[PDB]
Amino acid sequence: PQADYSGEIAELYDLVHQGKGKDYHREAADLAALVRRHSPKAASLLDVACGTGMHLRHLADSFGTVEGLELSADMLAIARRRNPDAVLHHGDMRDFSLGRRFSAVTCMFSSIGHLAGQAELDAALERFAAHVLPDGVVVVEPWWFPENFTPGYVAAGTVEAGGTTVTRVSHSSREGEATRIEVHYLVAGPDRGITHHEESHRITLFTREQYERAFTAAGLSVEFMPGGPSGRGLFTGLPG
């Protein structure tokens, strides 16, 4: 049971989230508009935990420079193939140092939840502040806050494309300060038969004030906007 977005799990990622109705084109359009509201001259964007680089692909149409940081080599390989021109980095949002600063540092789809507690979140936000330009914005899509988390939640969905049928079932429970989300897959095709895969993640249920404390310790002013890309809302931060 893996926790590192690798192997076959990485290969299924885009198909499954497409099946669940995720619309990266609309999300990118909205994000780019939000960046330009806070920074009308923005010409550059770093997407941290870029995964398979789906947002970056669309954001390349709005900004002259897009870069990405991704911990998982297998996700990153997909991201690079999708963004063959972009400079994408293999590393860790807790401790990274790129060549430059950007008008927007973004961290989407609750990837920030993969951090383990307040020290790590603080560290990541300090790094984001370190890579943002003075008239820029830091954008973090949080995981659920403890008060909005729904333990016992089961998601199931099946999709097919290109001869491959993929079923994904998730189960979520409370494990201390985090969601434990277990995810099983059945992957079927006419000649390959059926294979079973599993993943299991601890995604931290930070409170709003814990997010805010992280932005604040980084020198960033912080604003929460409810709703956002997944019903989890959006944090925006501005330097100095």
Ligand X SMILES: Nc1ncnc2c1ncn2[C@@H]1O[C@H](CSCC[C@H](N)C(=O)O)[C@@H](O)[C@H]1O
- Note whether 92 binds ligand X by CB under 6 A: yes
Q: Report residue 135 as tokens.
A: 């008239």
How many residues bind to ligand QDM according to rule CB under 6 A? 19
Pick what 89 binds: a copy of itself, ligand QDM, ligand X, none; C-beta below 5 to 8 Å, kind-dependent: none
Which long-range CB contacts under 8 A does 58-67 form with residues at least 24 apart?
58/24, 58/25, 58/27, 58/28, 58/29, 59/28, 59/31, 59/32, 60/85, 60/86, 61/28, 62/28, 62/32, 62/36, 63/32, 63/35, 63/103, 63/104, 65/102, 67/98, 67/102
Element (H, E) at 106: strand 102-107
Residue 83: how many CB atoms within 10 A of its CB? 22
CA distance 50 to 56: 7
Q: Is 24 annotated as a binding residue?
A: yes
Minimum distance of ligand X from residue 49's CB (angstroms) = 3
Closer residue to ligand X in complex, CB, 113/237: 113
Pick what 144 binds: ligand QDM, a copy of itself, ligand X, none; C-beta below 5 to 8 Å, kind-dependent: ligand QDM
Minimum distance of ligand QDM from residue 39's CB (angstroms) = 26
List 16, 32, 51, 178, residue binding ligand X (CB under 6 A):
51
- Note whether 142 binds ligand QDM by CB under 6 A: no
Residue with tokens 């941290």: 48
Q: Is 185 annotated as a binding residue?
A: no
CA distance 220 to 51: 25
Sketch the per residue contact string, 198 through 217, with ligand QDM: x for CB under 6 A, - otherwise.
Answer: ---x-x--------------
Pick what 85 binds: ligand X, ligand QDM, a copy of itself, none; C-beta below 5 to 8 Å, kind-dependent: none
CA distance 133 to 111: 22
Minimum distance of a copy of itself from residue 2's CB (angstroms) = 15
- Note whether 5 binds ligand X by CB under 6 A: yes
Determine contact, residues 14/52, Cβ cutoff 8 Å: yes
Which among 70, 75, 108 is positioned nearest to 89, based on CA atoms? 70
Pick what 97 binds: ligand QDM, a copy of itself, ligand X, none; C-beta below 5 to 8 Å, kind-dependent: none
CA distance 118 to 138: 18
Residues that bind a copy of itself (CB under 8 A): 151-154, 156-158, 165, 167, 169-171, 173, 182, 184, 186, 188-191, 193-194, 196, 198
Residues making up the binding site for S-adenosyl-L-methionine: 5, 13, 24, 49-50, 70, 92-93, 108
